[PDB]
Design an enzyme around this catalytic site. Structure first.
Site, PDB file in Angstrom:
ATOM      1  N   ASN A 174       4.026   0.191  11.547  1.00 30.61           N
ATOM      2  CA  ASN A 174       3.644   0.787  10.269  1.00 30.61           C
ATOM      3  C   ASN A 174       3.455   2.302  10.214  1.00 30.61           C
ATOM      4  OD1 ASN A 174       1.696   1.448   7.959  1.00 30.61           O
ATOM      5  ND2 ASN A 174       2.261  -0.669   7.494  1.00 30.61           N
TER       6      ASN A 174
ATOM      7  N   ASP B   8       0.788  -1.230   0.000  1.00 35.71           N
ATOM      8  CA  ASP B   8       0.000   0.000   0.000  1.00 35.71           C
ATOM      9  C   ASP B   8       0.823   1.285   0.000  1.00 35.71           C
ATOM     10  OD1 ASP B   8       0.959   0.158   2.575  1.00 35.71           O
ATOM     11  OD2 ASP B   8      -0.996   0.050   3.560  1.00 35.71           O
TER      12      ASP B   8
END
Length: 129
Positions: free
Chosen positions: A59, A48
């Site tokens: 993340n 992504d």
């Protein structure tokens, strides 16, 4: 920095992860093992566009800012580079927020698929704590 198994266990315990949110120390060591192989400098790009950082591969889409993840949050209010330090304080503090998010440690793909339901106690065995 590449931590030793027991060395990281001791560091995580000192920072309050042992039984944090009900997860025994072995769960955290196991998660770190399969997320980064105990390397604080580990980075991995996601499909992504986001990137995972540090010993617990946090993340950039929701937790830290790396300046290149469009429409992402920085819930831990830290630059992702802080998660690569030899000092694991930032990673631990952010991990505490993540694990309190609602899905517990299932937030870590490696934990769910390689630690959950296993003898995680083995990861701190033989360690002086």
């Amino acid at each position: 920095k590449v931590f030793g198994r027991c060395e990281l266990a001791a560091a995580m315990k000192r920072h309050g992860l042992d039984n944090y949110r009900g997860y025994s120390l072995g769960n955290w060591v196991c998660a770190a093992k399969f997320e980064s192989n105990f390397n604080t400098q580990a980075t991995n790009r996601n499909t992504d566009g986001s990137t995972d950082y540090g010993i617990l591969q946090i993340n950039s889409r929701w937790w830290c800012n790396d300046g290149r993840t469009p429409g992402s949050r920085n819930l831990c209010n830290i630059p992702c580079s802080a998660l690569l330090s030899s000092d694991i304080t930032a990673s631990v503090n952010c991990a505490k927020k993540i694990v309190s998010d609602g899905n517990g440690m299932n937030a870590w793909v490696a934990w769910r698929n390689r630690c959950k339901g296993t003898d995680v106690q083995a990861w701190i065995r033989g360690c002086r704590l």
